[PDB]
Amino acid sequence: DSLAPEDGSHRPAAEPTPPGAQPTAPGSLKAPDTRNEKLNSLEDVRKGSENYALTTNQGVRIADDQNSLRAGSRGPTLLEDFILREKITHFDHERIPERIVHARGSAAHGYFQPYKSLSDITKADFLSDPNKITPVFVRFSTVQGGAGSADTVRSIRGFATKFYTEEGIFDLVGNNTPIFFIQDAHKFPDFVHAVKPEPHWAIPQGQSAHDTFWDYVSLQPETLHNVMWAMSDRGIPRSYRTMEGFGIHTFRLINAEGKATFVRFHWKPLAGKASLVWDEAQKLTGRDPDFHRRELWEAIEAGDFPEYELGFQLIPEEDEFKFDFDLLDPTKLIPEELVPVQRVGKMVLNRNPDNFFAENEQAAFHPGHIVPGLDFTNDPLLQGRLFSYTDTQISRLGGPNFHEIPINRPTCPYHNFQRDGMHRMGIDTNPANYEPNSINDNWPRETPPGPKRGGFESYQERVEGNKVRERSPSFGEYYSHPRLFWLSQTPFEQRHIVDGFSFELSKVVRPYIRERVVDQLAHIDLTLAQAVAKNLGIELTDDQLNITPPPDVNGLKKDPSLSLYAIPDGDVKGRVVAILLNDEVRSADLLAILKALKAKGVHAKLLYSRMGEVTADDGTVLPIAATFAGAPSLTVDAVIVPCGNIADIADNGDANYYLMEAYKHLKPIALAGDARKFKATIKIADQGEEGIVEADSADGSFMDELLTLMAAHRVWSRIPKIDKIPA
Amino acid sequence: DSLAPEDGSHRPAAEPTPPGAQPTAPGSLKAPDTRNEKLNSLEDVRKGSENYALTTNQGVRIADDQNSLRAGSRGPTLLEDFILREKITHFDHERIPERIVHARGSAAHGYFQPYKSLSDITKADFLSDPNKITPVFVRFSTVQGGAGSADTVRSIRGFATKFYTEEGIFDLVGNNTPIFFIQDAHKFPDFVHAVKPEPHWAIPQGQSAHDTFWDYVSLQPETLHNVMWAMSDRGIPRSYRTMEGFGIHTFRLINAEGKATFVRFHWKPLAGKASLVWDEAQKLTGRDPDFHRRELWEAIEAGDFPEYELGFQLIPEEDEFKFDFDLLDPTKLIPEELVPVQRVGKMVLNRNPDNFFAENEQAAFHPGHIVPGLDFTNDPLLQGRLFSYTDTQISRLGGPNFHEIPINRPTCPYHNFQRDGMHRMGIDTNPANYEPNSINDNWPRETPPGPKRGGFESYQERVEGNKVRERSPSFGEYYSHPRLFWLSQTPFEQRHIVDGFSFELSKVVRPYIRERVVDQLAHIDLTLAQAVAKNLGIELTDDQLNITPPPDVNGLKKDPSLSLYAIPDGDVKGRVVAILLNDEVRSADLLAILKALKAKGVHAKLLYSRMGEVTADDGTVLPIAATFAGAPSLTVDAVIVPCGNIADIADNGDANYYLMEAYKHLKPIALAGDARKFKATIKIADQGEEGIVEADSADGSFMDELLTLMAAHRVWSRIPKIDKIPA
Ligand code: HEM
Ligand code: HEM
């Protein structure tokens, strides 16, 4: 019975459509022609559905899937009902342990390709040829919250990429800020317990704004650098497409001659950098907790494929000790003003998964998964990471055969003498399960290291020292990097940093914790320290006002690449506008609006005070995407109000509020014809104001003004005007 | 090191304190003297900390917990560092699968006591004497969301009680609505999959507002009854303390004479019934995803112990077929106007756990866990539940010995011949591990059924019919209960239901699903259906307008017990008021305000534009709990603005917004003296309006008027006035 509508509107068209135009769907159904070698190898396990009989897991067709088997229709359920018991058993056992950290994350498939061969600095096969494509799977995530926590919380973001290379899987497991909070892996559990929900009551979810986090931070000043990044707008990116990615650690590149070059990995978002503002981001955790997940998935369904440029910071082995910070300390960044990022390749994510659980939830990334041509360093954080990912995956994924879970399998050959383990898929036919063996003529065999297709050999780094549990003295500097970061931010970015700390610390119950954090800020920058103190009603002592600021980092008083916005990099393709309709829309305005949006690849969402349709003045029937309250201004990049019967919406509280919120959150607003009467709601200017586009009608000029504002992301100059507004 | 403040302010006092006054803490440190038998029996596994050396799990003291062992202070981490490896290993394996459903929950310890012996109707030992105290552990929960999802989502709530009786554990696993969505347990995986995040992209979290839910509901009209309850304000309770609880299924009570009586279990909230309004709930999911968890914990830390009355709907075996609905159908309620709830006992929750993971996360509740004196019925949803809880716990809790996890252990004796299994704690000394045996003289032995302390014997219900997979034809009625519920609601409740369906259907992307649900609403009630259809821009057809309304339920055209608010039952103790300060508060107003709240057990939170202190007009120093933006109006029940230097906050956007939000969400507001300048902000006439308390000062009847308003929970008369207002 219960079947599809006659018109076939239950099923999404298999072509790129704008967000909200069609029901989203499994990637292989939405984009059947989008392929890559990894995507294709997953076909052995894909399972369709159309035209097949419903069955048990043993293949027995089910006749009645609505009822348990009972002795009489009002009788007891019988134990012999094996259909019911398999069905309920499988349901009872759906859940697997979520990731210890980064449990909340969203992933997609794609491909990578280098711009040119890097064979002079590395023998890694995936970086050796500009026309040799490597399939990728990328998972972006938050850090602290559970798998069901919200996307747009304040947090560091993970950015993990699995490269299915010809010589093995390479996972580049990084974050959206260039440093981590702590120096040695031994303190990981300590840092993570402090930022996670407090042990007695398991509060708060997905947030650092609570006593144990600020306690830990105040007692461990090595965390201040990453805490500055987290409190800036870097902790609340607008989308996974508009954030940077970094491997943080110094790794090594090894070429065919055996030369080692120190390397730091970067991803540059080709959609530019952009973040939300705090109030918007926190409200968005309530209006749409899956905002980033949704936005990623929709951009891929729309053809706005997230694109990132892989880049390398390269430091010759002889310059190991030439900075004023240790290269092996993960709480220290390498300023691009000192070591520029060399462009290496492009990564495009062009296909969503079919099943979230099977591919996203069971994906396993590990910074230890390297290939010939790459090698580690002694960074003490990285070092302990090599132990942990392998270990956690044995319980998370139920045993040691997690490499056999479809998303995790290499697409290149894998042969060895490992056998058995829970849920073993691979049936080995080798007569031998050990080497050396003569009965299989010693196959599979070891392969010497060499220029290409060779066996892995570690770089022979010289090791000299006593066995000690000791932090390197060169790691003992905690304030100059925080200060460099502060000084490179724009004034409005600095304010947002002050506000992040003031908000967070105001949720710290124990007041001495607040004071101690303020004291640490005083070691970074007195202006910052005083601005946070003032918000906390704290007064800096005379001693605190005399703390000398830390030294510059190798002569640097600022580095503009550390700011999200000092260097313009705005891109409107893939952004979205809210269009507030009225019941007699002036079609001429809409037409002009939609044409200019379409030329720049900007999407639109048609909003009204009810769902269904409204008819424009020329008879055009406009389907309503959502209501004013149901898809808040939080979810769009700018707002446009066309003319028409404005009296229909002029007194609407949600419509008025829509604009006050957009205004407060510094988004571009454009008002045509009688829509300019809404200017009194956002109680400001009569001759106009930068950030508000206005005209008798929506024209070419009106739309260029709006699109230019959109390209600068937000109206920073409006900051001074928003704190009187009641929104 | 000795890191605590010398003042001792890192430590909350071990005495009842109001919410926000001190840092919250593990139950046994916060209320050491609050004991019960179960709480005392857990003392064997409680672990302290103070004054102990830091060790490995094997008892080896640790010297340096800040660093890994390496070959040189900048060298590689050594494999021999067993301290690092045990520490990271335990951390790496901290997580366990979350519950398949009801993963998000909050729990507490308490005790139960019956009002009088129920021996005439049940031989259940915990109900046989009013001086017999049974320890309980209760967990309240949402349904769909992960363990990290938000508290205040729209959803049914779970209400599970573990009774540690002298004759066994009895778990009463119910919800906050008297019926469930589906009739037979075979469809649980289908219903649950439909309500959970859609499989391709795992969106949306914690919400039924999406296509698959509404698709399922529109094809399975048996769900409408519970969908009505979920769409009403029942789905967004103000707190776990202000909601009702139900067992849902008909069970049996068996007395010593062998007589079976049918029973439905109810829990009445002694704090009264209270819910939020949708906008507030939704916004609260972002501002504080742990609002319910927090309120429960702080209520118990303040002495506002959540209290519930256990009540029984009793129906003689002879009346099984006397109703319009089948008693064994879980989608049907038993109208209290037909069968009154008989008061049975009182449950008081008076202590939080010590460790959320250990006690809450690992608690295992199961409706099949009954004791002599109770028995099941053939309700087909219940019948399948009896299989599921046992099964799911083998994987969630790691094996068949989950009854040995401290929180789950019986306080009464348990002895049998079961052995081994993962994580086996009990070391059995019985020479025999089988019965009958002669080698231990057959111990432990079976015990015949009897009036007290006898063995379990099922009631000998007659069974008759063929082995069939068949829904009873008596279950095929889907619309009269939904209609009864609808007609029992106040007019503002009906509107809220209409708004729930409207908002939810507005997030369904496929319009035909919205149409199909509207067609189903039209079989319940025309006014409901038309109002929802209008909100969706849908017109009912002439046939839909002529669908005949379903019959009354046994002559009833309404039952006021089904409404949250038709019959006042307001209780103010434990509610919280926001006090908006200024920098020279009339201290006379504040003294009047604070004393009056305290007299009724009403808590207060002093708010301002910054943290720190402000000084009242007489020099009283006032400590600030949070900012206007930091503890939004969503988290209080009422707002009071005292006189002083109102010009200080008159133009504060946040202060103004605070009132707008509280006014929009129907909360009582009280403005003293010059605080009445805020009337313009919320458009209050000069003459005033019901719901707004205003006077020249906070003396006389000012606090009595505000407290009368708090007792009625919200100002429903204000609904029409909020329609407009931009907030
Ligand atoms: C620079 C420092 C670090 C970065 C950039 C980082 C990044 C990440 C990312 C992006 C993920 C999620 C991968 C996914 O999407 O599945 C992750 C997970 C994880 N991280 Fe790291 N992390 C860092 C430090 C550490 C440390 C020091 C440890 C422990 C010694 C650690 C242990 C883990 C574990 C156990 C997981 C879960 C892996 C799984 O369950 O498969 N992380 N980390
Ligand atoms: C009258 C209908 C139902 C009610 C009132 C109900 C209530 C609940 C509650 C309150 C919980 C959470 C317990 C806790 O806090 O740990 C729960 C969990 C659960 N429910 Fe039920 N449920 C119902 C129907 C069902 C059905 C039909 C099934 C499957 C046949 C089912 C399977 C489960 C499972 C597997 C869990 C997780 C338990 C665990 O992991 O320990 N429920 N249910």
Specify whether the CB–CB gap between B587 and B620 falls below 8 A.
Answer: yes
CB-based burial of residue A396 (10 Å sphere; 0-12 exposed, 13-18 middle, 19+ buried)?
Answer: buried
Specify whether the CB–CB gap between B348 and B305 falls below 8 A.
Answer: yes
For the record, the structure tokens of B134 come out as: 């049974």
Confirm whether A606 is domain-assigned: yes
Token pair 């599809």 in the structure block, residue: A4
- CA torsion B32-B33-B39-B45 (nearest 10°) is 40
Distance CA B437, CA A86 (A): 35
* Nearest-atom index, ligand 2, CA of B100: 37
For the record, the structure tokens of B536 come out as: 């969706």
**Neighbouring-strand partners of residue A337:** none
Q: What is the DSSP letter of A198?
A: B
Choose the catalytic residue: B36, B175, B352, B582: B175
Using alpha carbons, list the distances in angstroms from residue A484 to A477, B621, B699.
13, 39, 56
B642: containing domain: 574-727
Confirm whether A438 is domain-assigned: no
- Domain total in chain A: 3
Using alpha carbons, list the distances in angstroms from residue B552 to A43, B322, B484, B549, B561.
55, 15, 7, 9, 16
The half-sphere exposure of A465 on its side-chain side, counting CA atoms within 13 A, is 19
Distance CA B320, CA B6 (A): 69
Nearest C-alpha neighbor of B526 from the set B509, B548, B508: B548
For the record, the structure tokens of B402 come out as: 């989950």
Rg (CA), chain B: 28
What lies within 8 Å, CB to CB, of B52 at 6+ separation is none
Nearest C-alpha neighbor of A598 from the set A703, A456, A696: A703
Distance CA A15, CA A302 (A): 8
For the record, the structure tokens of B143 come out as: 């349904």
B265 backbone φψ class: left, alpha, beta (φ>0; ψ -120 to 50): beta
Best probe of the A interface among B84, B90, B155, B186, by most A CBs < 10 A, is: B186
Listing from the earlier edge strand, what are the strands of the sheet with B692-695?
B626-627, B603-608, B576-580, B638-641, B669-672, B692-695
Q: How far is CA B381 from the centre of its chain?
A: 22
Residues 398-457, chain B: which have Cβ within 8 Å of A? Answer: none
CB-based burial of residue A53 (10 Å sphere; 0-12 exposed, 13-18 middle, 19+ buried)?
Answer: exposed
Are A67 and A127 in the same domain? yes
Specify whether the CB–CB gap between A705 and A698 falls below 8 A.
Answer: no
Rg (CA), chain A: 28
Distance CA A515, CA A522 (A): 10
Nearest C-alpha neighbor of A582 from the set A658, A517, A650, A526: A650
Which of A523, A552, A573 is at the close of a domain? A573
- CA torsion A79-A81-A85-A88 (nearest 10°) is -120
Nearest residue (by CA) to ligand 2, atom 39, is B99
For the record, the structure tokens of B450 come out as: 């009897």
Question: Which one of the ligands is nearest to B155 CA?
Answer: 2
Confirm whether A428 is domain-assigned: no
Residue-wise DSSP of B287-355: H-TTHHHHHHHHHHHHT---EEEEEEEEEEGGGTT-SSS-TT-TT----TTTSPEEEEEEEEEEE--S-
- CA torsion B370-B371-B374-B376 (nearest 10°) is 30
Amino acid of residue A40:
N
H helix and E strand count, chain A = 18, 20
Confirm whether B118 is domain-assigned: yes
Nearest C-alpha neighbor of A87 from the set A68, A71, A73: A68
Query: From the list A189, A384, A725, which residue is nearest B68 (CB)?
Result: A384
For the record, the structure tokens of A94 come out as: 């759906």
Question: Ligand 1 mean position to A499 CA, how many Å?
Answer: 28
Distance CA B20, CA B24 (A): 8
Confirm whether B419 is domain-assigned: no
**Neighbouring-strand partners of residue A613:** A623
Nearest C-alpha neighbor of B239 from the set B273, B192, B287: B273
Specify whether the CB–CB gap between A298 and A27 falls below 8 A.
Answer: no
Best probe of the A interface among B56, B463, B469, B610, by most A CBs < 10 A, is: B469
Nearest residue (by CA) to ligand 2, atom 42, is B385
For the record, the structure tokens of B648 come out as: 């200080």
Distance CA B241, CA B347 (A): 12
Using alpha carbons, list the distances in angstroms from residue B247 to A25, A75, B313, B333, B625.
38, 20, 11, 11, 40
Length of chain B: 727
Confirm whether B488 is domain-assigned: yes
For the record, the structure tokens of A481 come out as: 């990097």
Specify whether the CB–CB gap between B544 and B521 falls below 8 A.
Answer: no
Q: Is B145–A148 a contact, with Cβ atoms under 8 angstroms apart?
A: yes
Using alpha carbons, list the distances in angstroms from residue A721 to A178, A689, A706, A724, B604.
34, 11, 20, 7, 32
The greatest distance separating any two alpha carbons of chain A, rounded to the nearest whole angstrom, comes to: 91
Distance CA B154, CA B206 (A): 8
Amino acid of residue A317:
E
Specify whether the CB–CB gap between A454 and A372 falls below 8 A.
Answer: yes
Q: How far is CA A591 from the centre of its chain?
A: 35
Amino acid of residue B52:
Y
Distance CA A439, CA A430 (A): 9
Number of CB pairs, chain A paired with chain B, less than 8 A apart: 456
Confirm whether A182 is domain-assigned: yes
Nearest C-alpha neighbor of B327 from the set B368, B386, B381: B381
Are A285 and A367 in the same domain? yes
Which of A513, A546, A573 is at the close of a domain? A573
Confirm whether A440 is domain-assigned: no
- Listed in sequence order, the DSSP H helices in A524-652 are 526-536, 542-545, 587-599, 647-650
Q: How far is B479 from chain A (nearest CA, A)?
A: 19
Calculate ∠ Cα B358-B359-B364, nearest 5°.
Answer: 105
- CB atoms near residue A181 (< 10 Å): 27
Q: How far is B430 from chain A (nearest CA, A)?
A: 32
Distance CA B585, CA B697 (A): 12
Are B614 and B523 in the same domain? no
Binding residue per annotation — B240? Answer: no
Pairing of strands B69-71, A692-695: unpaired
Nearest C-alpha neighbor of A111 from the set A395, A247, A306: A306
Distance CA B196, CA B192 (A): 6
For the record, the structure tokens of B458 come out as: 């099922």
What lies within 8 Å, CB to CB, of A230 at 6+ separation is A154, A155, A156, A177, A208, A500
Nearest C-alpha neighbor of A30 from the set A38, A40, A20, A22: A22
Question: Ligand 1 mean position to A101 CA, how many Å?
Answer: 7
**Neighbouring-strand partners of residue A160:** A139, A173
Q: What is the DSSP letter of B203?
A: B
Are A316 and A342 in the same domain? yes
Q: Annotate A79-106 with three-state secondary structure.
A: CCCHHHHHHHHHHHCCCCCCCCCCCCEE
Distance CA B451, CA B259 (A): 12
Residues 614-633, chain B: which have Cβ within 8 Å of A? Answer: 624, 626-627, 629-630
Residue B57 phi, psi dihedral angles, 5° rounding: -70, -20
Length of chain A: 727
Are B382 and B257 in the same domain? yes
Which of B410, B437, B462 is at the close of a domain? B410
What lies within 8 Å, CB to CB, of A680 at 6+ separation is none
**Neighbouring-strand partners of residue A53:** none
Buried b (16+ CB within 10 A) or exposed e, A146-155: bbbbbbbbbb
Nearest C-alpha neighbor of A584 from the set A474, A523, A494, A674: A674
Distance CA B593, CA B640 (A): 8
Query: Quick one: chain B helix, strand, coil %, rounded to 5?
Result: 30, 15, 50
Token pair 């440093």 in the structure block, residue: A179
- Which residues in chain A have Cβ-Cβ distances shorter than 8 Å to B506? 611, 626-627, 630
Q: Does B141 touch chain A (CB under 8 A)?
A: no
Helix (H, G, I), strand (E, B) or coil at A578: strand
Calculate ∠ Cα A122-A125-A130, nearest 5°.
Answer: 90
Q: What is the DSSP letter of B55?
A: B
A465 backbone φψ class: left, alpha, beta (φ>0; ψ -120 to 50): left
Distance CA A402, CA A630 (A): 41
Listing from the earlier edge strand, what are the strands of the sheet with A576-580?
A626-627, A603-608, A576-580, A638-641, A669-672, A692-695
Specify whether the CB–CB gap between A469 and B64 falls below 8 A.
Answer: yes
Pairing of strands B576-580, B603-608: parallel
For residue B648, give the CATH number of its domain: 3.40.50.880
Q: Annotate B63-114 with three-state secondary structure.
A: CCCCCCEEECCCCCECCCCHHHHHHHHHHHCCCCCCCCCCCCEEEEEEEEEE
Residue-wise DSSP of A317-372: GGGTT-SSS-TT-TT----TTTSPEEEEEEEEEEE--S-IIIIIIT----TT---T
- CA torsion A333-A334-A338-A342 (nearest 10°) is -130
Q: Does B200 touch chain A (CB under 8 A)?
A: yes
Specify whether the CB–CB gap between B138 and B160 falls below 8 A.
Answer: yes
For the record, the structure tokens of A557 come out as: 């008083």
For the record, the structure tokens of B239 come out as: 């707190």
Residue A553 phi, psi dihedral angles, 5° rounding: -90, 105
Nearest C-alpha neighbor of A174 from the set A394, A387, A366: A366
* Nearest-atom index, ligand 2, CA of A92: 35
| E strand intervals along B523-610 | 576-580, 603-608
Is residue A405 lining ligand 1, measured as CB closer than 6 Å?
no
Distance CA B455, CA B450 (A): 7
What lies within 8 Å, CB to CB, of A538 at 6+ separation is A514, A515, A518, B612
Are B283 and B308 in the same domain? yes
Are B522 and B590 in the same domain? no
Are B287 and B169 in the same domain? yes
Amino acid of residue B341:
V
Are A536 and A599 in the same domain? no
Specify whether the CB–CB gap between B672 and B695 falls below 8 A.
Answer: yes
Residue B309 phi, psi dihedral angles, 5° rounding: -105, 125
Is residue A392 lining ligand 1, measured as CB closer than 6 Å?
yes
What lies within 8 Å, CB to CB, of B324 at 6+ separation is B477, B480, B551, B553, B554
**Neighbouring-strand partners of residue B174:** B159
Specify whether the CB–CB gap between A484 and A553 falls below 8 A.
Answer: yes
Are B39 and B64 in the same domain? yes
Distance CA B643, CA B640 (A): 10
For residue B543, give the CATH number of its domain: 1.20.1370.20
For residue B44, give the CATH number of its domain: 2.40.180.10
Are A523 and A630 in the same domain? no
Residue A612 phi, psi dihedral angles, 5° rounding: 90, -130
What lies within 8 Å, CB to CB, of A372 at 6+ separation is A123, A124, A125, A167, A168, A254, A449, A454, A455, A456, A457
Are B404 and B521 in the same domain? no
